[PDB]
Design a protein around this ligand. Structure first.
Ligand SMILES: Cc1cc2nc3c(=O)[nH]c(=O)nc-3n(C[C@H](O)[C@H](O)[C@H](O)COP(=O)(O)O)c2cc1C
Ligand SMILES: [Cl-]
Ligand SMILES: [Mg+2]
Ligand SMILES: [Mg+2]
Length: 135
């Protein structure tokens, strides 16, 4: 199960915000989210299980950030981005996402793991400027 991964246990010891998705199910829904993620976003565990985590995005989310994630997942690459997300009540926050594939012995992706960090406006600005300049 989700909490059987040693890196998941490690993240829990530090109370990180993370989710686990299941890409064997159509549209790669969330199948676990940590308490920090639920408090951050305003959703109960049962309500987020079964949703693709794109439910956190909205009209002011930059589609280029989303596309970078999409392509990373497609290309088998670790991906790190900052993008605007939305709580259940419509309020917004900047979210730094760290996404990786969890793989079996033959390389098959068995789950994805995504760590989330709420960051300040100032930090999001600095990060996105660096990302751009580095491009
Ligand atoms: C493990 C995992 C965790 C994710 N965490 C979130 C997140 O907190 N917020 C968000 O906007 N997208 C997150 N995503 C990204 C969306 O689920 C989706 O991959 C992204 O929108 C790109 O796919 P799409 O272009 O089909 O929407 C996560 C994705 C994965 C695989
Ligand atoms: Cl996805
Ligand atoms: Mg329902
Ligand atoms: Mg559900």
């Amino acid at each position: 199960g989700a909490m059987d991964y040693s890196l998941v246990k490690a993240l829990q010891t530090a109370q990180q915000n993370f989710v686990i998705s299941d890409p064997s199910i159509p549209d790669n829904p969330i199948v676990y989210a940590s308490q920090g993620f639920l408090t951050l976003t305003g959703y109960a565990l049962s309500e987020v299980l079964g949703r693709n985590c794109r439910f956190l995005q909205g009209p002011e989310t930059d589609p280029k950030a989303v596309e970078k994630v999409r392509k990373g997942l497609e290309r088998g690459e670790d991906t790190t981005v900052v993008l605007l997300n939305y709580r259940k009540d419509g309020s917004t926050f900047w979210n730094q996402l760290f996404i990786a594939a969890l793989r079996d012995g033959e390389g098959n992706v068995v789950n994805y793991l995504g760590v989330q960090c709420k960051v300040s406006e100032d930090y999001a600005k600095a990060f996105l400027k660096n990302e751009e300049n580095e491009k």
